[PDB]
Amino acid sequence: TTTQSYTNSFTRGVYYPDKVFRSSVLHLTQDLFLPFFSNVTWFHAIDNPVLPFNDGVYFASTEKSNIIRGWIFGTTLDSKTQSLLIVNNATNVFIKVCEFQFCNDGVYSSANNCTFEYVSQPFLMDLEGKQGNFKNLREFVFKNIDGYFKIYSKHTPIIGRDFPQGFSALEPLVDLPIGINITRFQTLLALNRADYYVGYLQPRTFLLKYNENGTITDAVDCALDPLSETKCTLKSFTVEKGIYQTSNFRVQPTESIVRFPNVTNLCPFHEVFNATRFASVYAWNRTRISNCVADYSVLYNFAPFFAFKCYGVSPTKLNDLCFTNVYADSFVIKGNEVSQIAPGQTGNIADYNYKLPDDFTGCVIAWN
Amino acid sequence: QSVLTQPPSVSGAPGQRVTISCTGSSPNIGARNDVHWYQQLPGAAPKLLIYGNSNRPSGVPDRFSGSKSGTSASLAITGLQAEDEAEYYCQSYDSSLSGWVFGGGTKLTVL
Amino acid sequence: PVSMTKTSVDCTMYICGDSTECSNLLLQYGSFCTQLKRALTGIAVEQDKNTQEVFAQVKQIYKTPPIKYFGGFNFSQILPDPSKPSKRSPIEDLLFNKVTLADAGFIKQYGDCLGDIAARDLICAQKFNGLTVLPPLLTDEMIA
Amino acid sequence: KFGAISSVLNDILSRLDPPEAEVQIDRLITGRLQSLQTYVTQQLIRAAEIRASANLAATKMSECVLGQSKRVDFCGKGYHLMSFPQSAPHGVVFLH
Amino acid sequence: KFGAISSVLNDILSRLDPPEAEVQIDRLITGRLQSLQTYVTQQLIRAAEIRASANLAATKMSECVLGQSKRVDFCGKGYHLMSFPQSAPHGVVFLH
Amino acid sequence: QLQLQESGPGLVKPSETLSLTCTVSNGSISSSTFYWGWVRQPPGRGLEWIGSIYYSGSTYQNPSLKSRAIISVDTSKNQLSLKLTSVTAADTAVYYCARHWDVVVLAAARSWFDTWGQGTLVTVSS
Amino acid sequence: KNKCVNFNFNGLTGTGVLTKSNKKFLPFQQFGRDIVDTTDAVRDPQTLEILDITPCSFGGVSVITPGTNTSNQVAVLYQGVNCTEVSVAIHADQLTPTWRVYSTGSNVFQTRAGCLIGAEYVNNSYECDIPIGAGICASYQTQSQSIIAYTMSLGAENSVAYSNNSIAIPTNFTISVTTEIL
Amino acid sequence: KNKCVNFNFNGLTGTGVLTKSNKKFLPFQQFGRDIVDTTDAVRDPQTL
Ligand SMILES: *[C@@H]1O[C@H](CO)[C@@H](O)[C@H](O)[C@H]1NC(C)=O
Ligand SMILES: *[C@@H]1O[C@H](CO)[C@@H](O)[C@H](O)[C@H]1NC(C)=O
Ligand SMILES: *[C@@H]1O[C@H](CO)[C@@H](O)[C@H](O)[C@H]1NC(C)=O
Ligand SMILES: *[C@@H]1O[C@H](CO)[C@@H](O)[C@H](O)[C@H]1NC(C)=O
Ligand SMILES: *[C@@H]1O[C@H](CO)[C@@H](O)[C@H](O)[C@H]1NC(C)=O
Ligand SMILES: *[C@@H]1O[C@H](CO)[C@@H](O)[C@H](O)[C@H]1NC(C)=O
Ligand SMILES: *[C@@H]1O[C@H](CO)[C@@H](O)[C@H](O)[C@H]1NC(C)=O
Ligand SMILES: *[C@@H]1O[C@H](CO)[C@@H](O)[C@H](O)[C@H]1NC(C)=O
Ligand SMILES: *[C@@H]1O[C@H](CO)[C@@H](O)[C@H](O)[C@H]1NC(C)=O
Ligand SMILES: *[C@@H]1O[C@H](CO)[C@@H](O)[C@H](O)[C@H]1NC(C)=O
Ligand SMILES: *[C@@H]1O[C@H](CO)[C@@H](O)[C@H](O)[C@H]1NC(C)=O
Ligand SMILES: *[C@@H]1O[C@H](CO)[C@@H](O)[C@H](O)[C@H]1NC(C)=O
Ligand SMILES: *[C@@H]1O[C@H](CO)[C@@H](O)[C@H](O)[C@H]1NC(C)=O
Ligand SMILES: *[C@@H]1O[C@H](CO)[C@@H](O)[C@H](O)[C@H]1NC(C)=O
Ligand SMILES: *[C@@H]1O[C@H](CO)[C@@H](O)[C@H](O)[C@H]1NC(C)=O
Ligand SMILES: *[C@@H]1O[C@H](CO)[C@@H](O)[C@H](O)[C@H]1NC(C)=O
């Protein structure tokens, strides 16, 4: 059983994005960070839902002695794609990539085609000053850029009565070439017979004040507040009183209008289409069409065509073309003769009555 | 629960350009998150048009072009036709809610 | 002269009209325009300080007594004339009239380039390309 | 155009394909950037001249207006009595 | 990079052939040479302004320190009595 | 091609459990590569994601409707099951079974809904 | 009209805003241009009315704040922008930069140079602390603390009384030491 | 040390001179850089 309460993260989850030394510098980085003052899903423990894992995850928890063993990573968590496990035992870690099947609870039942076992000093350090009130809060940040799993951690000593507001950096612990994709992320539990904070990272532009000895004192964003923006763009932590110029304010156009002339200039298409005495095929009437706007809707609405094939142009693409001249040859003809009329055809009509040239740029219309 | 903001309605002449925009808050959907676009004919299931902010599935016309910059995302329609009138939806993933979200739905009307 | 019009050129608008590809090409050219913006800001502040130093030499604003008889010396022409709404001297009036500014700057010419019919004059055209001006801090009345 | 197909960026991006229109737009960028550098340098020169004249005007005000200047041919030709400043657009005018 | 393969000259010379990397290194040279010209021009402008201020400081010293200056509002606000110079890093400070 | 058939009582009295179920044809719900989910859309409003569920039993789920929505899956009969309790007048909507959120390669932010059901108009009345 | 729109008038393509017009296009005239060759006015090809063109929304955002040692309260400025536009155009834009802001704190104080979205206007005569432009100066003052905007004051108002037979002569004297740095 | 030498410290290549040091690299720190991004210090990969 678990709950999904929401809490504020304050300023929390800033690490060393690099490995380099800086003293009294105000270096600015653009890396994956947990946004300041972003809500984080606070869980509870008394089954172990599978949380996403996208561009990393911030993990933090507080427990009295031990309730958390490790985390399971990978995709589909089964014997079809490679997996990962960070189970932390008494005094060692069991980092390995494998193809674990399923446990639902002595945690995996398959080790097929898998390697890269790793063992080092334990991740979870527990120290008590002869009292249980000292409940250390352990934070972790995982991410999977170009493989190369990275884990950062620091166990703050601040009681654990509430989520601290003070600043605590994150020192890297391990960096290993895992080499497999990770999308889902679970957690394991313990057995001896107010924790489980989770946040998600997104790319952001921070500003970190490196101390003299390389520690991090304080950091600000430039995606949170106007003050934070000016403080980031005027790189410094103290902004003197005055006016400052940060960026430019634009507005894109909302709607696009086009306006072409009032022209109607209706072609004599109606006259031919609403004609009665259509001349025969042996005397095909050729009507010259010029100095007019060739609207094809008047053609569409006047005849329920049975053959509207086109050769040199697209039947849909006729509104957006301008033609030097248009010729309309109209004749009443039989049924099969309609399909007989086409470029590169033959017959008693295509050879003796009306022949369509091979290089024809136009369309034919046939309606009963 | 509408973390993505959409224009209630829009209209235009057939065969013209219309732009549909979708943006979200800052601590919510971020730069890495991508925005997909869904079309819903009345009384029908929503249909996908653009995913990955620049890619379309098989059968989706190249007329529908979209883009995402920073947080704001938008579509561009060329050669508007009478069949394009539908309910359009923008959707992406909200890192603060750990779950997907959908836009309010914009009304595209052909004039 | 005491100062010139303050210009606030911005590299993105000038060199890449709403084109992300051009913006990326400019970004490839590095920070070649941050110094340009900084220099323009510097000269803007320099004119502001110039006019402040030239004019505001006095801490307390004095006013002439209600009567004006200075031993026969008839200033009038140089003292402010309350009848005029600008509270300016006639010589100031002639100086204002004889000088014609293509760019007044403090007109906020937005709203009339969309109602101008005639030539989109120097100022609307400069706005067209991303070229802006700023209003001086000491407006033309308080200097009087 | 500075040596491109056209001086209209919108026209050239939509008339040629990106990887080859890149050279033309880059040389466009170089031309306009050099012109803007020329503009800012010339404006800095103008700013220096204007600041020199503004310092001269400030000294002239502080001497001739707020007192009598014994400097000959500084506040008007001849022996000097007063000076009444007057305002002007982007400048000042005295009455020595 | 100004629009080259890389901004590291050592990397680019050892990664491409001489006769073709010549274009990239030449555009590198052009970019950095324009940058250096901009630097020297801006520094000349700074030198002109600094020399104007140095002439003003020299005149202020030679008038206010080595004598009393009748010029009103030159050596401090109001009627002037003395002036004690003091040294400062890349500058001077008076006590009018 | 992948088809979805979901059914349920289109009329339910206020305040008890509401239950629908989707059917997958020309495919298998045991397909590990993709997820499966339910999306509801009230009339005159926008789409709303009510939860997604994997074949094993892991469940995506919207925190706003945490205490009312239970989603279950079975691989034997290829059935996607959704339950909703404490239904009130604000839950009138048309429900869809959806397939999305590829696990092998895409991440949880680039996931897009791909397959949609025909929809069932479900209302609550007294 | 009166909205940032995209236009394709009879073959002329650009972006701008439009309204009614009051000059005298000749009957044969169709188009608009200027001294430095920029298109201004396009005759309506379906109304024979004159409409004009303006660059979409150009502006520059600036932040006025007291020292961070004093307060985190800031007021934002948008240079030369009518501030119905900033408010209605907030939606459907980028949000991290190109500031979103929900205009709450006595916003749209439209000045002659822009508008302070986050500052309250007032009629007083304090000295300038943070010059703004067009004779406006903001200052952090206790209300219980907020940023106010007010017109410049050129100094404490004073008036001597020039009288035909009035002389005032100081009876005491002071010595002061200023400082000039060069 | 104390001589104009060429260095290829664990992937970092350049020319310079070296000597002992008296500041406080964190244990995980390996490298050196500055405000304007120039490499200063390299931890000895065989002496720490
Ligand atoms: C985040 O938390 C704040 C304060 O606790 C609350 O006002 C806000 O509604 C929360 N937002 C989300 C998406 O949970
Ligand atoms: C923890 O795991 C290591 C590595 O397999 C093992 O050597 C050690 O004995 C284990 N400790 C236990 C099980 O307490
Ligand atoms: C076995 O694992 C290796 C490395 O994890 C991988 O390259 C290979 O494809 C795997 N083979 C099988 C049959 O799973
Ligand atoms: C169980 O709890 C007891 C008392 O806290 C402790 O001494 C013991 O080590 C625990 N056992 C395990 C396996 O954690
Ligand atoms: C940095 O190291 C010096 C050297 O011992 C020490 O005196 C100082 O306290 C250290 N600073 C911090 C913040 O730890
Ligand atoms: C001709 O016009 C008349 C009048 O509108 C219409 O009733 C008829 O259907 C038309 N026929 C054709 C073939 O266009
Ligand atoms: C051909 O059609 C036109 C248009 O209707 C008509 O004027 C002409 O008389 C026709 N010619 C013949 C020979 O019928
Ligand atoms: C001062 O001169 C002006 C013009 O020379 C004249 O109109 C005005 O009456 C004069 N004032 C007095 C008090 O004589
Ligand atoms: C892992 O992800 C990368 C990029 O997201 C992709 O190219 C690759 O095919 C993926 N591999 C697997 C096994 O999913
Ligand atoms: C344009 O066409 C419309 C359509 O009826 C008409 O009302 C209007 O008078 C026409 N104007 C001109 C100038 O042709
Ligand atoms: C901030 O600094 C100013 C500058 O002297 C000072 O007047 C003010 O009292 C300071 N405020 C605080 C809270 O330190
Ligand atoms: C801003 O728009 C309103 C609305 O028409 C108008 O009344 C006002 O004059 C405009 N102000 C400026 C400075 O453009
Ligand atoms: C300032 O004065 C104007 C004009 O007298 C008045 O309309 C406004 O209400 C005044 N505002 C305050 C805060 O006194
Ligand atoms: C100064 O002299 C003028 C002219 O005689 C007279 O009108 C005025 O009243 C006098 N003022 C005083 C204060 O004596
Ligand atoms: C002049 O001023 C000084 C300083 O305030 C004071 O000590 C002295 O008594 C004053 N002289 C007279 C005559 O009041
Ligand atoms: C490095 O290796 C040498 C070889 O014996 C050894 O003396 C030295 O202690 C080692 N140092 C480290 C930090 O590994």
Numbering used by the authors:
A (entry chain A): 23 to 68, 80 to 138, 158 to 210, 212 to 246, 263 to 437
B (entry chain L): 1 to 111
C (entry chain B): 728 to 871
D (entry chain B), E (entry chain A): 969 to 1064
F (entry chain H): 1 to 126
G (entry chain A): 535 to 677, 689 to 727
H (entry chain C): 535 to 582
Q: What's the publication's text?
A:
The currently dominant variant, BA.2.86 sublineages, with over 35 mutations in Spike (S), showed higher immune evasion and formed a distinct BA.2.86 sub-lineage branch via phylogenetic analysis of the primary sequences of S.1 To mitigate the spread of epidemic and impact on public health, a large number of monoclonal antibodies have been developed and deployed rapidly. Here, we found that two δ-class antibodies, XG2v046 and XGv280, which recognize the conserved epitope of NTD and can enhance RBD exposure and S1 shedding by promoting RBD to assume “up” conformation as a neutralizing mechanism, have broad-spectrum neutralizing effects on SARS-CoV-2 variants. In order to identify the epitopes, we determined the structures of BA.2.86 S-trimer in complex with Fab fragments of XG2v046 and XGv280 at 3.40 Å and 3.75 Å resolution, respectively. The epitopes of the two anti-NTD NAbs are conserved among VOC, VOI of SARS-CoV-2, and even RaTG13.
XG2v046, XGv280 and XG2v024 share 6 identical residues (Y28, P85, N87, T108, T109 and R237) involved in NTD interactions. However, unlike XG2v024, which locks S in a closed conformation, both XG2v046 and XGv280 placed RBD in “up” conformation, with the binding of XGv280 triggering the opening of RBD at a larger angle compared to XG2v046. By comparing the RBD “down” and “up” conformations of apo BA.2.86 S-trimer with the RBD “up” conformation triggered by XGv280 binding, we found that the counterclock-wise rotation of RBD (from down to up) was accompanied by the counter clock-wise rotation of NTD, which indicated that the moving tracks for RBD and NTD were inversely correlated, where RBD tended to shift upwards and NTD inclined to move downwards. Binding of XGv280 to NTD pushes the linker (residues 528–532, between RBD and subdomain 1) back-downward by up to 7 Å, allosterically leading to a more erected RBD and thereby conferring loose and flexible upper architecture formed by three S1 subunits. Perhaps correlated with this, we observed low-resolution structures of the dissociated S1 trimer in complex with three copies of XG2v046 or XGv280 Fabs. To further verify this, we compared the spike cleavage efficiencies with or without treatments of XG2v046/XGv280 and observed dramatically improved cleavage in spike when treated by XG2v046/XGv280 as evidenced by the ratio of full-length spike to S1. These results unveil a neutralization mechanism for XGv280 and XG2v046 by facilitating spike cleavage and early S1 shedding via allosteric regulation. Compared with antibodies which were not mixed with XG2v046, the neutralization potency of the mixture (anti-RBD NAb mixed with XG2v046 at a ratio of 1:1) against BA.2.86 (IC90) or JN.1 (IC50) increased 7.5-fold or 7.2-fold on average, respectively. A similar trend was observed for XGv280, but the neutralization potency was enhanced to a smaller extent (5.5-fold for BA.2.86 and 2.3-fold for JN.1).
